[PDB]
Amino acid sequence: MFNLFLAVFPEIFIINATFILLIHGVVFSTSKKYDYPPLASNVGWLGLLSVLITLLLLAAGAPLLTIAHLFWNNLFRRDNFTYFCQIFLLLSTAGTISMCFDFFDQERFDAFEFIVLILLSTCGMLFMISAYDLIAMYLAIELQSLCFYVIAASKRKSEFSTEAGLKYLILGAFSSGILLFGCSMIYGSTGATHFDQLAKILTGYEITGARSSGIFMGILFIAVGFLFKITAVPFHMWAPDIYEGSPTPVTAFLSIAPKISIFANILRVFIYGSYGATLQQIFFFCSIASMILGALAAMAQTKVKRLLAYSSIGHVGYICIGFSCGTIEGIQSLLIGIFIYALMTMDAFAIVLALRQTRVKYIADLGALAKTNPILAITFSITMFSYAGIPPLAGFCSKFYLFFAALGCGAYFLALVGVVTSVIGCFYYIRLVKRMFFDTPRTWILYEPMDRNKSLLLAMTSFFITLFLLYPSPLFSVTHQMALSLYL
Amino acid sequence: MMLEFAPIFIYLVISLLVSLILLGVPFLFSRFDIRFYLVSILFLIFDLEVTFFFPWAVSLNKIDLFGFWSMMAFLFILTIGFLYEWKRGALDWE
Amino acid sequence: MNTDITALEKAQYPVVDRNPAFTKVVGNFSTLDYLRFSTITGISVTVGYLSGIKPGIKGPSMVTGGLIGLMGGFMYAYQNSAGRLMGFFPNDGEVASYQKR
Amino acid sequence: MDLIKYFTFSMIIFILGIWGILLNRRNILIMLMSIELMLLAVNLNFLVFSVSLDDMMGQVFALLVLTVAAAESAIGLAIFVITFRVRGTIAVEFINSIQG
Amino acid sequence: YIAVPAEILGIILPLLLGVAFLVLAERKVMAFVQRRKGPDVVGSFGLLQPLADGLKLILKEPISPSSANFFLFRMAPVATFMLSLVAWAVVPFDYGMVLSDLNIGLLYLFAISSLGVYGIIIAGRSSNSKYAFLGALRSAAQMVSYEVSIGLILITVLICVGSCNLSEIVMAQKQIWFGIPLFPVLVMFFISCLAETNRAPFDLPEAEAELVAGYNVEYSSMGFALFFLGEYANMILMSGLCTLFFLGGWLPILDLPIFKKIPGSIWFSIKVLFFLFLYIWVRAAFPRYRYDQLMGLGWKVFLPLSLAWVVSVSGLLVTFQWLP
Amino acid sequence: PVMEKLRMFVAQEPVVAASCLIGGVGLFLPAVVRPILDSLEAS
Amino acid sequence: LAQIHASENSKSFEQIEVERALRKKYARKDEDYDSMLGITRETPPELILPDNVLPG
Amino acid sequence: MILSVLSSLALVSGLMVVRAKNPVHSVLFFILVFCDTSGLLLLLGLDFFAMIFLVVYIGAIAVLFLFVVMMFHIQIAEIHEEVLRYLPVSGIIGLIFWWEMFFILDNESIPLLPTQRNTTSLRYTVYAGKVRSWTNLETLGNLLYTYYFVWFLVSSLILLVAMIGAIVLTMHRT
Numbered sequence A: 001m002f003n004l005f006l007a008v009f010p011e012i013f014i015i016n017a018t019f020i021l022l023i024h025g026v027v028f029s030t031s032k033k034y035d036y037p038p039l040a041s042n043v044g045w046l047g048l049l050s051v052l053i054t055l056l057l058l059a060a061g062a063p064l065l066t067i068a069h070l071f072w073n074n075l076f077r078r079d080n081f082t083y084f085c086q087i088f089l090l091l092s093t094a095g096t097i098s099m100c101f102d103f104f105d106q107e108r109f110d111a112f113e114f115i116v117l118i119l120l121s122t123c124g125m126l127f128m129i130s131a132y133d134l135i136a137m138y139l140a141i142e143l144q145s146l147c148f149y150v151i152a153a154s155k156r157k158s159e160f161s162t163e164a165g166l167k168y169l170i171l172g173a174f175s176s177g178i179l180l181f182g183c184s185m186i187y188g189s190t191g192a193t194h195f196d197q198l199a200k201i202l203t204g205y206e207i208t209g210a211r212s213s214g215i216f217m218g219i220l221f222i223a224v225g226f227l228f229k230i231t232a233v234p235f236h237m238w239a240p241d242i243y244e245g246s247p248t249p250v251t252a253f254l255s256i257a258p259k260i261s262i263f264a265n266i267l268r269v270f271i272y273g274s275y276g277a278t279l280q281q282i283f284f285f286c287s288i289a290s291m292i293l294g295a296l297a298a299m300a301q302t303k304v305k306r307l308l309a310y311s312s313i314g315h316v317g318y319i320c321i322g323f324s325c326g327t328i329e330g331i332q333s334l335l336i337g338i339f340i341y342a343l344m345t346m347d348a349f350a351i352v353l354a355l356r357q358t359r360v361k362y363i364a365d366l367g368a369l370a371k372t373n374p375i376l377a378i379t380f381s382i383t384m385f386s387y388a389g390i391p392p393l394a395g396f397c398s399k400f401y402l403f404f405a406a407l408g409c410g411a412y413f414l415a416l417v418g419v420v421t422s423v424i425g426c427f428y429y430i431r432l433v434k435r436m437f438f439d440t441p442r443t444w445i446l447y448e449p450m451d452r453n454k455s456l457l458l459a460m461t462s463f464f465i466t467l468f469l470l471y472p473s474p475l476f477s478v479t480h481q482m483a484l485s486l487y488l
Numbered sequence B: 001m002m003l004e005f006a007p008i009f010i011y012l013v014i015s016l017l018v019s020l021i022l023l024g025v026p027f028l029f030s031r032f033d034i035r036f037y038l039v040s041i042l043f044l045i046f047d048l049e050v051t052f053f054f055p056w057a058v059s060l061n062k063i064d065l066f067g068f069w070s071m072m073a074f075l076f077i078l079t080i081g082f083l084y085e086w087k088r089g090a091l092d093w094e
Numbered sequence C: 001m002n003t004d005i006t007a008l009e010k011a012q013y014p015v016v017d018r019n020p021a022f023t024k025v026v027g028n029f030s031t032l033d034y035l036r037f038s039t040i041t042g043i044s045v046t047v048g049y050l051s052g053i054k055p056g057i058k059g060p061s062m063v064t065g066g067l068i069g070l071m072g073g074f075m076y077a078y079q080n081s082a083g084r085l086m087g088f089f090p091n092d093g094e095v096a097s098y099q100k101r
Numbered sequence D: 001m002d003l004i005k006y007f008t009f010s011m012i013i014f015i016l017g018i019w020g021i022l023l024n025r026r027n028i029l030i031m032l033m034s035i036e037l038m039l040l041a042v043n044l045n046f047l048v049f050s051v052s053l054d055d056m057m058g059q060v061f062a063l064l065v066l067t068v069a070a071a072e073s074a075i076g077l078a079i080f081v082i083t084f085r086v087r088g089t090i091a092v093e094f095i096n097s098i099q100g
Numbered sequence E: 001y002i003a004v005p006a007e008i009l010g011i012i013l014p015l016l017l018g019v020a021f022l023v024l025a026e027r028k029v030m031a032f033v034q035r036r037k038g039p040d041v042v043g044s045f046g047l048l049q050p051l052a053d054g055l056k057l058i059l060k061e062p063i064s065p066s067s068a069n070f071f072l073f074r075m076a077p078v079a080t081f082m083l084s085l086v087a088w089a090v091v092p093f094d095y096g097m098v099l100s101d102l103n104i105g106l107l108y109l110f111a112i113s114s115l116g117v118y119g120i121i122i123a124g125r126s127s128n129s130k131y132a133f134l135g136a137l138r139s140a141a142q143m144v145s146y147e148v149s150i151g152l153i154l155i156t157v158l159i160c161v162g163s164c165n166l167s168e169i170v171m172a173q174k175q176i177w178f179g180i181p182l183f184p185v186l187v188m189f190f191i192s193c194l195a196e197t198n199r200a201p202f203d204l205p206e207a208e209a210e211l212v213a214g215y216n217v218e219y220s221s222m223g224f225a226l227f228f229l230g231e232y233a234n235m236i237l238m239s240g241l242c243t244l245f246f247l248g249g250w251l252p253i254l255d256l257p258i259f260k261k262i263p264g265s266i267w268f269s270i271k272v273l274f275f276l277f278l279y280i281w282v283r284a285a286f287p288r289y290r291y292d293q294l295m296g297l298g299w300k301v302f303l304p305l306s307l308a309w310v311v312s313v314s315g316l317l318v319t320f321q322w323l324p
Numbered sequence F: 001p002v003m004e005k006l007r008m009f010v011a012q013e014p015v016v017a018a019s020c021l022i023g024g025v026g027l028f029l030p031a032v033v034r035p036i037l038d039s040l041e042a043s
Numbered sequence G: 001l002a003q004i005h006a007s008e009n010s011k012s013f014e015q016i017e018v019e020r021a022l023r024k025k026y027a028r029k030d031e032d033y034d035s036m037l038g039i040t041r042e043t044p045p046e047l048i049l050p051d052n053v054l055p056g
Numbered sequence H: 001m002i003l004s005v006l007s008s009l010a011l012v013s014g015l016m017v018v019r020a021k022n023p024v025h026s027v028l029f030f031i032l033v034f035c036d037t038s039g040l041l042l043l044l045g046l047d048f049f050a051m052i053f054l055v056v057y058i059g060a061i062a063v064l065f066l067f068v069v070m071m072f073h074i075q076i077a078e079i080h081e082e083v084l085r086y087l088p089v090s091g092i093i094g095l096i097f098w099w100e101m102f103f104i105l106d107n108e109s110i111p112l113l114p115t116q117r118n119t120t121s122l123r124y125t126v127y128a129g130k131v132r133s134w135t136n137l138e139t140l141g142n143l144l145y146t147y148y149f150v151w152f153l154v155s156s157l158i159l160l161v162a163m164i165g166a167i168v169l170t171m172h173r174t
Ligand SMILES: C[C@@H]1CC[C@@]2(OC1)O[C@H]1C[C@H]3[C@@H]4CC=C5C[C@@H](OCCC(CO[C@H]6O[C@H](CO)[C@@H](O[C@H]7O[C@H](CO)[C@@H](O)[C@H](O)[C@H]7O)[C@H](O)[C@H]6O)CO[C@H]6O[C@H](CO)[C@@H](O[C@H]7O[C@H](CO)[C@@H](O)[C@H](O)[C@H]7O)[C@H](O)[C@H]6O)CC[C@]5(C)[C@H]4CC[C@]3(C)[C@H]1[C@@H]2C
Pocket: B005, B006, B008, B009, B012, D001, D002, E086, E108, E111, E112, E115, H001, H002, H035, H036, H038, H039, H040, H042, H043, H054, H114, H120
């Protein structure tokens, strides 16, 4: 009996460690004897440790995660794809946590519950990746969402943070209701919620004239929920406001991990299921809309956070082009894009968090940065050029695939849109470089140097961004492996 | 069978009529306190706990040890939450 | 409760015990298992101590880190030992001990 | 005709939630209430289908969805409370400062 | 179904009479403890006092203050009164003596109890009076707080019985009354019943002298009477529930032919009378808690103990395989 | 010296201590006694 | 002014260390979390200058 | 007919939820909607869910909403607006949803037209399933804690998040 639970050792450990940290934090934060010490950094270090131990347990036990698969079948499904997705999710969570300590001590954000909520949301996203039934998928999505709602409003006396939370909760709850409605329609039409059963029922028919309008609209509503989650246009406008109004570590965490989890869900639901061309057309139109709107709105922005939010919207458009084309290379390119975008976003938010120690808000606040911190201005410039997709930086992969699929699926309007939006993006990315290097403002802002954690993370992500294309084989092989494991 | 609910409806109708008769015969001759929200939240949580207890209580003879320990784990999570509330002063009305 | 230990990906090494008992797995702990266990626990205690200095609770922080490390290290050692007995990990020692007792 | 009548009941509840979103641009509390109405309609959809299909999966998920609805309302009303506390008012013109 | 209204009236009317005389019995017992005579002028031994008081109330002019919640103000007492009445549809007085033999009767009682709070809340809010509103909020919070412990004790009984059917709960006590092994649970249940019915030592609405205005202070004539009647009917119901769950309902004390001679309804009535006497006795014996103290007792004492009893009973019954 | 700290906790929080003892018995019986009773039945 | 300068320049090693730690602890604040905890952190008197040297 | 009555009550009560000027009134109508829903559940034979909808939706969730809305003391000026100018946008959105979504089951689940013949005699009774009938409660409890226990525990995690968030966002300890 005990050995059956080897399939959930990683999750058991992280949940138990989260409980231990909750108890530790609440017991000593309330201690008069110790004079109510702030425990955000102490619990943060212990939680980073817990995340790393979870990663060790998961990575080193790859076969064991598939033990007792028949017993666990109606609860979840673990395979190679989920293996790599969960490893990447844990790595992203560890990096995001490591970027938070200067924020904890200098702002004096003393709430250790922040770390606990991050860990519980990580548990939720882990269960999201392995979900193999509509019920499990919904429950894990809701756990993740509720944790985000709470942490988005963590600055509870701030107008901005409270506004972010309110908008997030209302729009999140609305989208979740729409998705749940879709799930109910699919169950009513097919008598099934398990992904295997849905695959068997729906395969071979798609729209064979006598199409289940119940099945067709259930798929549509579920897709609407998914598109809200990935911040695809027209279900996107929550994202810029929430990203800007939330505390910056929250914004960094939301920018990466939920995308990984929800894209795992989307792959395993749609790609593994079957209504077909309708849904790929959904993602096609949403990709085009996201690219165009992201480019234009980002061009309008004068503030750093909003610029990065709109940039992420545009990039999810680029990524969803891969899902749309419906090929093994499409899935592989989507995964490569997710990985590279995540690393670049981690780099960008490490810089943003470093600059938040002097309250960076506007793009113009970067003036004369090439004088006051030359190596920081260069590092940030490499990130921008990578965001623009200039070769040989890592960001060039997403552009290359966008056009590869445009000429592979046979889509020339898509190629035209890609060209135009890429040029617009390059303009608003090099505007930052111009501000740091070319401008001569009358008043300068002198920034405090970053802590060791962010400097090390920045140093590694900056080598990856510059040098990835010299040795890109491991990512290519692992992503091809994952794309194949979805069906075999 | 749902047959036994019909007398309840007729009982409700009669009780309502008695209420109207009794009440109608004499016509012939800005300070928000968060602790209420908090007690509402606690009641909601333990209301759901009782809700989940009901099927478990009637099903103990069939679920045996596995069901017992799964409910115990459920209770462990909820009781950790309760300990958190207790330490934070949510249960103190002074 | 019906149970089925059968894994999706078959074991690539001889199966000494398909579903080893808890105490059998613990008694199967090797020197390397104990090294992994002790290393994880020691690192966790060290992190607890160092991160506890600024709040002033280095002792209790050491205890908390040590509890996390003890649980994680035991889970990791159990994972390795059970995987060896089940044939999922290289298990030369288990096979040698099995072919003799 | 039973199944079409049970489904249109839940359907009118869902459409009412949608209309409540549409008609309450100055009243975000009612917007939250409309979202609960939609969640109730979905829950009813699972229960009706469970009976119609003679299957228990609709019933398990209905209970879990009730748990989600409870947690959602708790957290949402907390966020409402803190927004009101910061502004002293619930009017929508005081929650429009993030834009662009 | 044509005879169903006759059965319903045969429940409701004697219940209203019983409430009218419970008020008199409370006055009499309180007086006798206090070395005085209660009402003994209006009728012989004061037995006509309840009719006179009810007649006075119906002949009293209603006030209906100039509030903006004209409908809600009068409907709140109707709601609480109807809820007090409808719980008796599932109460069995003897084997086969019950209006609705609900299989889900225990949860139905819990639902009715949970619904009881709305009359008090609406009366407080609709009355256009800050004192009534504050008192109603405090009373509502107290009732919801003690409802948790009531529900957990219900779960303990359910674990022992394996069915939500009240008659089955009674017949499961043929071997032994549940109040013997679960005596602390019964004490907890009685105290929680006191708190849930806003009764002494938990009667905040009665604490006008303590600068705590009750939720019904603006009510006159028959709305106030409806609140009062619902409260006393709920006291009778809580006594009946204590009898059903722990004292074996209609069962005799000993399974002997001498005890089986007297009908089960009489056994049930006698146990209910004991519990009503304890209600009155407790009101006569002790002072009252403050609101904060009783809230602390609800959340810090009775909830943990109720949960612990759930765990202990279930674990013991699972271990030795004594489950129903 | 944690043997009067437990004494002090029991003296100051009798309800919590009683709840812990009652629930702990309820957890101990299935965890320890039940497998013993199952083992004695096999032989 | 001489009083505050004389007081600072005559401090021993131990007091210098104590005041370094105290200064670091009270350099920033989270009054919202303190209100959640229901406590009020007060500046220690060894970090408060006399009123006769303050600008007002 | 009975479903017509309950659906009409639900329709009117829901319109009152979304259209009442006073938010306290909206909460009270919401409570009427849950009562009607419970009636439907009783018609379906799901008495456990019928009772739980009263216990949780009305007994706990609506109470929370009522406590919060009552202490807010919202003035109508802060949330008032004329809705006559929304009739067209609601007309198109409602109609499209109406035409699509009230009739989605019609092609898959074609109704049986009631004829002028007693079909009740064609009801086949299998007594084998009637020897030991299961309540809704015990059928659900047979599954929640053993075969689908992981989802049960994840729901517990969701409730824990609710508790933590409620404390962290609103607590001001005296
Ligand atoms: C604690 C607090 C207090 C508040 C509260 O809780 C909380 O308090 C709680 C108290 C609750 C009430 C409790 C109780 C009820 C009664 C229920 O109402 C029963 C209705 C059902 C039962 O009705 C019949 O059931 C049997 C017949 O079915 C009868 O059996 C005969 O027939 C047998 C067979 O020959 C013989 O063998 C027997 O010998 C012979 O006697 C039986 O006598 C009779 O009862 C369903 O019936 C219908 O359903 C049919 C199907 O749809 C419809 O058929 C139609 O459509 C068909 C096509 O589809 C066409 O083919 C048809 O031609 C065409 O007619 C039709 O409309 C109609 O029949 C309606 C809900 C309500 C009000 C609750 C509301 C909510 C509360 C107030 C709660 C509230 C919230």
